[PDB]
Design a protein around this motif. Structure first.
Motif, PDB file in Angstrom:
ATOM      1  N   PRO A  94       0.803  -1.234   0.000  1.00  0.00           N
ATOM      2  CA  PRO A  94       0.000   0.000   0.000  1.00  0.00           C
ATOM      3  C   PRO A  94       0.827   1.270   0.000  1.00  0.00           C
ATOM      4  N   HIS A  95       2.018   1.255   0.602  1.00  0.00           N
ATOM      5  CA  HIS A  95       2.868   2.442   0.582  1.00  0.00           C
ATOM      6  C   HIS A  95       3.212   2.829  -0.848  1.00  0.00           C
ATOM      7  N   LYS A  96       3.594   1.841  -1.659  1.00  0.00           N
ATOM      8  CA  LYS A  96       3.915   2.109  -3.053  1.00  0.00           C
ATOM      9  C   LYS A  96       2.681   2.554  -3.825  1.00  0.00           C
ATOM     10  N   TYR A  97       1.519   1.973  -3.520  1.00  0.00           N
ATOM     11  CA  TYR A  97       0.288   2.406  -4.175  1.00  0.00           C
ATOM     12  C   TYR A  97      -0.009   3.870  -3.882  1.00  0.00           C
ATOM     13  N   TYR A  98       0.111   4.280  -2.618  1.00  0.00           N
ATOM     14  CA  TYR A  98      -0.173   5.669  -2.271  1.00  0.00           C
ATOM     15  C   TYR A  98       0.857   6.613  -2.879  1.00  0.00           C
ATOM     16  N   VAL A 101      -0.113   6.937  -6.465  1.00  0.00           N
ATOM     17  CA  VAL A 101      -1.315   7.753  -6.609  1.00  0.00           C
ATOM     18  C   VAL A 101      -0.964   9.231  -6.524  1.00  0.00           C
ATOM     19  N   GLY A 102      -0.219   9.617  -5.487  1.00  0.00           N
ATOM     20  CA  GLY A 102       0.156  11.016  -5.352  1.00  0.00           C
ATOM     21  C   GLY A 102       0.988  11.506  -6.521  1.00  0.00           C
ATOM     22  N   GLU A 105      -1.165  11.619  -9.812  1.00  0.00           N
ATOM     23  CA  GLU A 105      -2.148  12.694  -9.764  1.00  0.00           C
ATOM     24  C   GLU A 105      -1.485  14.048  -9.960  1.00  0.00           C
ATOM     25  N   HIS A 119      -8.787   6.929  -8.698  1.00  0.00           N
ATOM     26  CA  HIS A 119      -9.473   6.037  -7.772  1.00  0.00           C
ATOM     27  C   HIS A 119      -9.096   4.599  -8.100  1.00  0.00           C
TER      28      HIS A 119
END
Lengths: 132, 258, 101, 149, 137
Positions: A94-98, A101-102, A105, A119
């Protein structure tokens, strides 16, 4: 024979999602458009710009999330807002996903001068509609 | 003004004193922020006792009045921050400073009340003195929307709730939360750490004092909507449930723990 | 980093035509009238001929913006028929669908 | 016990309810006040709690559009006026009041007035370019026996 | 129990300038999906009725633009693929609503405009005679 956007049955072993399992002549009937913008409507302009932006967004999100996207992206445009809805696997942390995402974006918002949002819907594995 | 402010910011207290001396030599007039920086530099420069520091602060205030320089919220905020070093003696002049604020018309902000509460938070029994200040502060702030005026404003609620947890006053905690949940005041909750500490203390006090039904209602409303509970908070919730003999939800709490 | 040297040439032509668009418009407007004296129209003719060849808007070719295909390009989407068919068949283009009636 | 906001005070300041409110905007923006505004903003800064606040923040930063939609929002055409766009005969001062040159410039000005895309500055640029071109071609015009220069 | 004790109302100001009078707005929404247009029509109708605005609804005839492309790549001219774009229309005719009401309703229904749906709103604005038109120069 028609070879366009079709998956050919060989041994009934190849898993295919809902999108891949349907030939193009089903777009208006069983699988809505993966992108939704007003450019292609009657009397509306900038269809080519929207198409080019959509192609770049797809090719960019495919490489930014290597081996993570479960299915093709869904691009929605509302005013100047752009929303990328992506079905992603749960392989990555999840760290890599966030972080991604940032990063994506911010970079897309600065590149296209529009408030891009991303999303992610996570699935344990690629959803199999049928086998071919 | 700016040299003094920068040297105070960088803790160049002796250099700030030298700049003050140079200002006096030039016979010029500073402003309110410069006087506040000078007060901070004078207080933090030497380890003198309370008497010298208070006399110097009063002399600086009188000098500011003589220089036709008007006060501001920053003046009293820095005065309280400096007086925090001498809790025992400063417990008395804090009310005098607050009354000075009221008389001038300088309405104390959230940070001013936070500094007053911290000053009253002397290591020891808080019921003796904080009981005379916290209720008055809550009455003054009751039903009042606030605006960002001072850098320490965001701390206030946290500190308040902490001492609320010390006082075991469920009604006072409810009043503090209602103050937080009034208009835009929630934006003054502070950073992530302050928010987590505030909510942890608030929920711990609710579990300790409030009825288990309202305790579970608050558990649903705040967790995980407001914050993720600490293990100690869950332990206190389990203890409260065990006291109320409502053991049937104990496995569910374990699920929540997972 | 365009698709081919032909797309690069077309980009150069478009940029040069945009640069010289106003001068060409003014000189051609001087030419395309029956009011001004014929000698002034002749000097305007030699002036517009003196402009660089690649500045003429007629030399601009509508190539596909993703494969540089010169022919079979739909103007609305600026894409060749093959690329447009690919994108529409995959459904990546909003609204466009197979026509059956 | 008793109210703590009344009683003996420091008694150093007066009842000056008015703070330093004198206007001093003529000075250059001081770095100190600018950075202290950042401290105040951080005091009021909190993460977004719902989508509506995200939209409000985006609109405040200008990223979002301002509904209801104004297709001309953010555009003023250099603050021009309709009479400036339409009546371009005022710029026809150096050109002769009659002759083929005046007729051609009348056609050009009518076309420019019909143009809704060019700005007033661009139309003036076109008129001035024609003026300079005709001034440079004065010898040919005089040889052709049409009044100019 | 965590309901806000007191909410803050948005700042609403009354300007001495007379409000603009709108006789009729024709909100013509175009889309590719009939169900989406139906849902948006339901939304707009409910919002207008809750705001007390006189609204009628009709459906202009749909448009279908069709074109034809070569199916193969090199040479199969006899074989083609035909593509079409369907633009379905829904016209909401609002009548006798003021400028502020028109602005707030348009903002509410445009912020919630679904993706893939375009809007063309025409505002018939009532005006009085100009000052210089009552009598000659």
């Amino acid at each position: 024979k028609n070879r366009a956007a079709r998956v050919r049955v060989s041994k009934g072993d190849k898993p295919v999602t809902y999108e891949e399992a349907h030939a193009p002549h089903y777009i208006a009937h069983r699988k809505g458009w993966l992108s939704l913008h007003t450019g292609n409507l009657d009397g509306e302009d900038h269809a080519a710009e929207r198409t080019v932006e959509d192609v770049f967004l797809r090719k960019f999100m495919w490489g930014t999330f290597p081996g993570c996207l479960a299915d093709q992206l869904v691009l929605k445009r509302r005013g100047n807002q752009l929303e990328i809805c992506a079905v992603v696997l749960r392989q990555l942390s999840p760290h890599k996903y966030y972080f991604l995402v940032g990063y994506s974006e911010t970079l897309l918002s600065y590149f296209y001068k529009c408030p891009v949002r991303l999303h992610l819907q996570t699935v344990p594995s690629k959803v199999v509609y049928k086998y071919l | 003004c700016t040299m003094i402010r920068g040297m105070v910011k960088h803790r160049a207290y002796e250099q700030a004193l030298n700049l003050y001396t140079e200002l006096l030599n030039n016979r010029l007039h500073a402003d309110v922020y410069t006087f506040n920086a000078l007060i901070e530099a004078t207080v933090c420069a030497i380890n003198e006792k309370f008497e010298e520091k208070w006399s110097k602060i009063l002399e600086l205030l009188r000098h500011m009045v003589a220089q036709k320089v008007k006060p501001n919220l920053q003046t009293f905020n820095t005065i309280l921050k400096c007086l925090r070093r001498f809790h025992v003696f400063a417990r008395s002049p804090a009310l005098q400073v607050l009354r000075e604020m009221k008389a001038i018309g300088i309405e104390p902000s959230l940070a001013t009340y936070h500094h007053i509460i911290r000053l009253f938070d002397q290591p020891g029994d808080p019921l003796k003195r904080s009981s005379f200040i916290i209720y008055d502060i809550m009455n003054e702030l009751m039903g009042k929307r606030f605006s960002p005026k001072d850098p320490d404003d965001d701390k206030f609620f946290q500190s308040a709730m902490s001492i609320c947890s010390s006082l075991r006053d469920l009604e006072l905690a409810y009043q503090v939360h209602g103050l937080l949940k009034t208009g835009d005041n929630w934006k003054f909750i502070g950073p992530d750490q302050h928010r987590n500490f505030y909510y942890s203390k608030f929920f711990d006090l609710i579990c300790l004092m409030e009825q288990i039904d309202v305790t579970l209602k608050w558990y649903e409303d705040l967790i995980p909507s407001a914050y993720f509970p600490h293990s100690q908070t869950m332990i206190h919730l389990l203890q409260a449930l065990d006291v109320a003999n409502r053991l049937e939800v104990i496995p569910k709490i374990w699920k929540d723990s997972k | 980093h365009y698709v081919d040297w032909r797309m690069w040439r077309d980009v150069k032509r478009r940029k040069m035509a945009y640069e010289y668009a106003d001068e060409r418009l003014r000189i051609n407007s001087l030419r395309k009238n029956t009011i001004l004296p014929k000698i002034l129209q002749d000097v305007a003719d030699e002036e517009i001929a003196a402009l660089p060849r690649d500045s003429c808007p007629v030399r601009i070719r509508n190539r596909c913006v993703m494969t540089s295909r010169p022919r079979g390009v739909k103007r609305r989407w600026r894409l060749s028929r093959i690329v447009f068919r690919h994108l529409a068949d995959h459904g990546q283009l909003s609204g466009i669908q197979r026509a059956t009636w | 016990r008793k109210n703590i906001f009344t009683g003996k005070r420091l008694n150093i300041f007066d009842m000056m309810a008015v703070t330093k409110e004198a206007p001093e905007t003529d000075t250059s923006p001081s770095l100190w006040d600018v950075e202290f505004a950042k401290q105040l903003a951080t005091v009021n800064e909190q993460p977004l709690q719902n989508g509506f606040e995200e939209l409000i923040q985006w609109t405040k930063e200008g990223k979002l559009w301002e509904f209801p939609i104004n297709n001309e929002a953010g555009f003023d055409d250099d603050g021009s006026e309709f009479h400036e766009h339409i009546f371009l005969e005022k710029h026809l001062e150096s050109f002769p009041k009659q002759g083929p040159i005046r007729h051609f410039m009348e056609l050009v000005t009518c076309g420019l007035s019909k143009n809704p895309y060019l700005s007033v500055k661009q139309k003036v640029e076109h008129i001035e370019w024609f003026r300079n071109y005709f001034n440079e071609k004065k010898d040919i015009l005089k040889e052709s026996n049409i009044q100019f220069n | 129990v965590d309901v806000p004790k007191d909410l803050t109302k948005p700042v609403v100001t009354i300007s001495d300038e007379p409000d603009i009078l709108y006789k009729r707005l024709s909100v013509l929404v175009k889309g590719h999906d009939k169900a989406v247009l139906d849902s948006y029509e339901y939304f707009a109708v409910l919002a207008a009725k809750e705001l007390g605005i006189s609204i009628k609804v009709h459906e202009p005839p749909r448009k279908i633009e069709r074109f034809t492309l070569l199916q193969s790549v090199h040479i199969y001219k006899k074989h083609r693929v035909q593509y079409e774009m369907r633009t379905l229309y829904r016209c909401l005719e609002l009548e006798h609503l003021t400028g502020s009401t028109a602005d707030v309703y348009l903002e509410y229904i445009q912020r919630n405009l679904p993706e893939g749906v375009a809007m063309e709103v025409t505002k018939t604005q009532l005006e009085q005679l100009p000052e210089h038109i009552k009598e000659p120069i």
